[PDB]
Amino acid sequence: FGGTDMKKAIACLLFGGSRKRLPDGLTRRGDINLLMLGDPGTAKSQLLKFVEKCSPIGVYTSGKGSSAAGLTASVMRDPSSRNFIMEGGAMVLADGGVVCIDEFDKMREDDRVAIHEAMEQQTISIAKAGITTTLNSRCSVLAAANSVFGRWDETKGEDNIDFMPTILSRFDMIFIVKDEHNEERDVMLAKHVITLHVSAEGEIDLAKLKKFIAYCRVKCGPRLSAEAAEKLKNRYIIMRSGARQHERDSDRRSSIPITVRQLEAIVRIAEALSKMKLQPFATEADVEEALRLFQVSTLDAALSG
Amino acid sequence: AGTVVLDDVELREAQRDYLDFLDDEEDQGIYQSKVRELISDNQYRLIVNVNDLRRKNEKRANRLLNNAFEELVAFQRALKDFVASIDATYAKQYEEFYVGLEGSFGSKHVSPRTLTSCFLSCVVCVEGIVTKCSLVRPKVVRSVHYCPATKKTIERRYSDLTTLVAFPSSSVYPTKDEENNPLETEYGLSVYKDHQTITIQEMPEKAPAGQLPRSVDVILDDDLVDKAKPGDRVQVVGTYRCLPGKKGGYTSGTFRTVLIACNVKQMSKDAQPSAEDIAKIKKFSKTRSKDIFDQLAKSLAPSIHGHDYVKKAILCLLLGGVERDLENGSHIRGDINILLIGDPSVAKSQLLRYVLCTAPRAIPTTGRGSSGVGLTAAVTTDQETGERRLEAGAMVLADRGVVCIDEFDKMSDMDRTAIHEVMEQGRVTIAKAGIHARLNARCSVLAAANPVYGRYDQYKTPMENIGLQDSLLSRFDLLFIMLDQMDPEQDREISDHVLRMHRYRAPGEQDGDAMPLILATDDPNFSQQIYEKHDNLLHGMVSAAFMKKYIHVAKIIKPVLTQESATYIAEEYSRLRSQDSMSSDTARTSPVTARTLETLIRLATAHAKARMSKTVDLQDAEEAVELVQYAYFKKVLE
Ligand SMILES: Nc1ncnc2c1ncn2[C@@H]1O[C@H](COP(=O)(O)OP(=O)(O)O)[C@@H](O)[C@H]1O
Ligand SMILES: Nc1ncnc2c1ncn2[C@@H]1O[C@H](COP(=O)(O)OP(=O)(O)O)[C@@H](O)[C@H]1O
Ligand SMILES: [Mg+2]
Ligand SMILES: [Mg+2]
């Protein structure tokens, strides 16, 4: 039920932006990163499960890896055969895919390093006694979590999250899901759940949707039209100025910054929107929708304080 | 005597075709020049491009790639004949000449996982990572013996039957004369060839994530023995064959397959660099000798806007200083260490990846991804000979190179302390009771750190914002605090640059398609204009390849400090140490020691090298002074 903005963000995440490499050799990732902080009642885990099931290549794990399956990749030389066995975690297993990381706030320090260096550069760099490799992890990170206190209390705004600016920068979009006060919403949710259970058209089945996503990703790589890029530049300038103003007014550094990573996140969302239609160029409508979704994400960067 | 061959039509045709291909005077002359080159260099192996062979003769290419052994024998006979024709006196020195291959192999370019039975006796090209590297043992091919009783001397010839059926009579080493007199082997007259066996493993990044590795055994004969070491990425071209077992009345179908390497080449084709280009570099250096450094700095990281001083420092790093090895063995390092301590999303990681892609021998390390023995050298036991062996680490590999340490701040204090010797004197001293070693790692460190609290709090001093001790910071000669400045104008600049780069598209190669997610095409890592074309979507700029070549040529030059620059640097260092050099409300980002004077000298030498000056002049000294002044102080606001 509900969560329409989150569902649109999930579709954008599934279709992804456009991976780019410039002449100098550098790379710009085309995979969106989504975070879903919210109360435990909501269906964040269910959304992650569906995303894993529907993605062409998708692995659903936890912050502390999984049972007998790690989160990132390690390499160990077998002393007898001397071969370097590469133990692959979720990130390397879902290369060119999606990693649905539930309980994102409960990771180890090594996992934190690996995710920091893999959410943006899409690579895991390992250097054991023998070799110095750089594994490839092209994966969109769909992370779930909960408030540090278990439930979000507005009285402690900007303190319900324990994540660092360095890790929140890596995220393209961040959503906050509350469940506080709506009797109408509660009755509708109960009706919908009881419906679902008893029942167990404009809806693309899972198989065709997965094939559609794969086809779009393989075929189309969009870009930005000049007018759309100019509009995005203006909106980004005003948004950064507003963030600066809010931070200076609150006299506290908001723990969810707006940065060039956010600019590129809007770019990637627009590219994904265009890719849905297979338009080799992104239009002002697509950039406006991307900005609207990033605004729904920004309803915690500025409004929360 | 036995069954000799009188005439052989196929062998004669093959040798004639190969001799024709090698004789190039009516053609361009590439291979005649190559043979002359190997004659001059005193070698006995020629690298022949399979592409050229296929171009001049398709039939010979197919025959060579599908039945390699006899085809390579014919090719080597033709090579020896051609070398004799050019000069017989040199051709007489070496018993045989060898033909290694290179270029593009269509379906014969495989990984150890894809090297299956179908490629037996064919020529294959396998790219992989070395795991095992046995000792270089001499293998006797011609043994001389002396009989003290009869004063006779004998020669026994052993054929290289590595993959052919071998009978004991061939391998019988003689010890007694015909009448059982004792024979003494004369080692000084016998002939031995170096032999080695290595193992090539499927590259960890290219191998499937789920499954275990796959490896192939490689035999390297003379001239190819010490070309590779464990952990290296190499391309081995050779014949995939079957090894005979041992004499036995019973056998299973199983056979032990190996690869007799005909050539081995380093993956680091970028580790190595025409008269046109040399003259181009000369004119580029001569024409604008003052702003050349600034132009190179701006063109270094084109995809990243601003960060002028950071890019200048990165250029100084890539150039490196001039080491001073004194008459007493004392060592003063020449490498240059940069620590980008910065707010999130300020392109420090992108600068790291740029240096990775550009510099030769650049090793990417991460905070907790390379701990201790993985980051520096190590000592292990063979587990077969029960003897201790060294194992090179990240920095030992990066010797005469760069180590890009992402998230350096989040390295354990243990590792950060272990790296001190590498930073200062460029070596790792490691010892276990069995074995003690002093490995050389003259690497330059490029670290990307974020400050405590995540974002640099400009109200607090740089000492507090940098969660590192002064002893560690002194290791980094340049320390750059890269803030995410909140200026709307600079924000406009950055946003415009970012959106232009995101809008850019490849020229012609792409028209709206998606980038793809390798054996089909030749592997780029092993693959064989001063300014860029002024595209408006990229510029609104020295070429990458020319920048690479120019930096390579300018690295070797060794400018010498002149008395005027020495006096200037000394005076500036005295001032920097003095308290007056920093006003009120400005805090030192790193204490100023004699390490900073060495930083000044190294930066001035790097600038002089950028200009190919041959002398570090007052211009270079002033530039180094300005960069140090910018880097070593920060203005704290209230
Ligand atoms: N909005 C919703 N619509 C329908 N069912 C829901 C909704 N929210 C929660 N549920 C049901 O309640 C369960 C609890 O949600 P869960 O998947 O555990 O999310 P999380 O634990 O990540 O908050 C789900 O399995 C789902 O069946
Ligand atoms: N000055 C800049 N010029 C160009 N791109 C920038 C700049 N600042 C930030 N970016 C963009 O923001 C992203 C930040 O990613 P990265 O550099 O990996 O992290 P960090 O900047 O924290 O090291 C990059 O993809 C880069 O394109
Ligand atoms: Mg959950
Ligand atoms: Mg980073």
Please state the three-class secondary structure of A8-59 as a single string: HHHHHHHHCCCCEECCCCCEECCCCCEEEEECCCCCHHHHHHHHHHHCCCEE
In contact, A20 and A59? CB cutoff 8 Å:
no
In contact, B514 and B526? CB cutoff 8 Å:
no
Amino acid at site A121:
Q
Cα separation values, A219 from A210, B151, B505, B515, B572, Å:
14, 82, 16, 9, 60
Sequence-distant (6+) residues with CB within 8 A of B226 are: B136, B196
Q: Which alpha helices (H) appear in B288-408, and where do they start and end? A: 292-300, 308-319, 348-358, 394-397
Would the annotation count B350 as a binding residue? yes
Question: What is the secondary structure of B69-90 as a DSSP string?
Answer: HHHHHHHHHHHHHHHHHH-HHH
Longest dimension (CA), chain B: 104
Q: Are the beta carbons of B131 and A259 separated by less than 8 Å?
A: no
Helix axes B68-86, B30-41, angle to 10 degrees: 70
Spatial CA neighbour of A43 closest among A173, A163, A175, A156 = A175
Cα separation values, B632 from B338, B567, B635, Å:
12, 21, 11
User: Quick count: other Cβ atoms within 10 Å of Cβ A181?
Assistant: 7
Identify the three-state secondary structure at position B265.
strand
Spatial CA neighbour of A259 closest among A168, A176, A175 = A168
Experimental method: cryo-EM
Interface of B with A in 274-303 (CB under 8 A): 301-303
Calculate ∠ Cα B258-B260-B262, nearest 5°. 150
Does the C-beta of A130 come closer than 6 Å to ligand 1? no
Q: Are the beta carbons of B544 and A25 separated by less than 8 Å?
A: yes
CATH number at residue A234: 3.40.50.300
Sign of torsion over alpha carbons B88, B92, B94, B95: positive
Question: What is the secondary structure of chain A as a DSSP string?
Answer: ---HHHHHHHHHHHH----EE-TTS-EE-----EEEEE-TTSSHHHHHHHHHHHSSSEEEEETTBBTTB-SS-EEEE-TTT--EEEE--HHHHTTTEEEEEESTT---HHHHHHHHHHHSS-EEEEE-SS-EEEEE--EEEEEEE--TTSS--GGGTTTS----HHHHHT-SEEEEE---S-HHHHHHHHHHHHHHHHH------HHHHHHHHHHHHHHB--EE-HHHHHHHHHHHHHHHHHHHHHHHHHTS--SS---HHHHHHHHHHHHHHHHHHT-SEE-HHHHHHHHHHHHHHHTTTTTT-
Q: Is B259 left (phi over 0), alpha (psi -120 to 50) or beta?
A: beta
Would the annotation count A292 as a binding residue? no
In contact, B623 and B603? CB cutoff 8 Å:
yes
Query: What single DSSP character describes residue B176?
Result: B
Of A26, A96, A261, the CB nearest to B354: A26
Spatial CA neighbour of A14 closest among A76, A69, A56 = A56
Identify the three-state secondary structure at position B47.
strand
For β-strands B256-266 and B215-220, DSSP reports them as parallel
Q: Are the beta carbons of B209 and A88 separated by less than 8 Å?
A: yes
- Tokens describing residue A141: 């990170």
Check chain B for breaks (C–N over 2.5 Å) and list the residue before each, or none: 273, 517, 528, 540
Using only C-alpha atoms, chain B has a radius of gyration, in whole angstroms, of: 30
Sequence-distant (6+) residues with CB within 8 A of A188 are: A1
Q: Are the beta carbons of A132 and B301 separated by less than 8 Å?
A: no
- The CA A145 to ligand 1 mean position distance, Å, reads 13
Identify the three-state secondary structure at position B540.
coil
Amino acid at site A103:
E
Amino acid at site B122:
C
In contact, A76 and B224? CB cutoff 8 Å:
no
Sign of torsion over alpha carbons B66, B68, B69, B71: positive
**In degrees to the nearest 10, what's the CA dihedral of B18, B23, B28, B29?**
120
The helix (run of H) or strand (run of E) holding residue B547 is helix B544-556
In contact, B94 and B41? CB cutoff 8 Å:
no
Sequence-distant (6+) residues with CB within 8 A of A158 are: A252, A254, A255, A256, A304, A305
Calculate ∠ Cα B256-B124-B113, nearest 5°. 60
The Cα of B196 is separated from the nearest Cα of chain A by a number of Å equal to: 17
- Tokens describing residue A140: 């969109």
A95 vs B: CB within 8 A: yes
Cα separation, A91 vs A126, in Å, equals: 14
The residue written with tokens 């379906």 in the block is B107
Amino acid at site B413:
D
For β-strands B184-201 and B123-133, DSSP reports them as antiparallel
Q: Is A173 left (phi over 0), alpha (psi -120 to 50) or beta?
A: beta
The residue written with tokens 């002939």 in the block is B191
Counting the structural domains of chain A, the total is: 1
Cα separation, A237 vs A247, in Å, equals: 15
**In degrees to the nearest 10, what's the CA dihedral of B20, B25, B31, B32?**
100
- Tokens describing residue B540: 């609104």
Resolution of the experimental model, in Å, one decimal: 2.8
Sequence-distant (6+) residues with CB within 8 A of B486 are: A240, A244
- Tokens describing residue A46: 């269910």
A22 vs B: CB within 8 A: yes
Amino acid at site A166:
T
- DSSP-assigned beta bridge partners for residue B342: B482
User: Quick count: other Cβ atoms within 10 Å of Cβ B570?
Assistant: 13
Question: What is the secondary structure of B400-419 as a DSSP string?
Answer: TSEEEEETGGGS-HHHHHHT
A-chain residues within 8 Å CB-CB of B215? 83
- Tokens describing residue A180: 């506080």
Spatial CA neighbour of B220 closest among B257, B263, B164, B255 = B263
Sequence-distant (6+) residues with CB within 8 A of B296 are: B315, B542, B547, B550, B551, B610
Does the C-beta of A43 come closer than 6 Å to ligand 1? yes
In contact, B217 and B258? CB cutoff 8 Å:
yes
- DSSP-assigned beta bridge partners for residue A86: A75
In contact, B220 and B146? CB cutoff 8 Å:
no
- The CA B349 to ligand 4 mean position distance, Å, reads 5
Q: Are the beta carbons of A125 and B205 separated by less than 8 Å?
A: no
- Tokens describing residue B182: 């004792």
Spatial CA neighbour of A261 closest among B340, B301, B308, B349 = B349
For β-strands B184-201 and B215-220, DSSP reports them as antiparallel
Does the C-beta of A259 come closer than 6 Å to ligand 1? no
In contact, B234 and B109? CB cutoff 8 Å:
no
- The CA B211 to ligand 4 mean position distance, Å, reads 30
In contact, B198 and A66? CB cutoff 8 Å:
no
A134 vs B: CB within 8 A: yes
Cα separation values, B618 from A251, B169, B322, B608, Å:
46, 77, 17, 10
Calculate ∠ Cα B4-B8-B13, nearest 5°. 145
Identify the three-state secondary structure at position B62.
helix
The helix (run of H) or strand (run of E) holding residue B631 is helix B618-631
Of B347, B365, B383, the CB nearest to A79: B383
Amino acid at site B506:
A
Spatial CA neighbour of B418 closest among B359, B477, B370 = B370
**In degrees to the nearest 10, what's the CA dihedral of A103, A104, A108, A111?**
130
Ligand 1 atom 15: residue of nearest CA: A43
Q: Are the beta carbons of B365 and A125 separated by less than 8 Å?
A: yes
For β-strands B109-110 and B123-133, DSSP reports them as parallel
Spatial CA neighbour of B557 closest among B622, B596, B609 = B609
Q: Give chain B's length.
A: 638
The residue written with tokens 């994540």 in the block is A163
Q: Which alpha helices (H) appear in B419-505, and where do they start and end? A: 420-425, 462-465, 470-475, 488-503
Using only C-alpha atoms, chain A has a radius of gyration, in whole angstroms, of: 20
Question: What is the secondary structure of B179-222 as a DSSP string?
Answer: TS-B-EEEEEEEEEEEEEEEEEE--TTTS-SSSPP-EEEEEE-T
Each as own residue / partner, the long-range contacts of residues B165-173 (CB below 8 Å, 24 or more positions apart, any chain) are: B165/B244, B166/B244, B168/B247, B173/B143
Cα separation values, B110 from A301, B163, B218, B264, B541, Å:
51, 21, 14, 15, 39
- DSSP-assigned beta bridge partners for residue B457: none
Identify the three-state secondary structure at position B264.
strand
Spatial CA neighbour of B513 closest among A14, A19, A212 = A19
Q: What is the extent of the structural domain holding A163? A: 1-305
CA B55 to chain centre: 31
Backbone angles phi, psi at A142, to 5 degrees: -105, 100
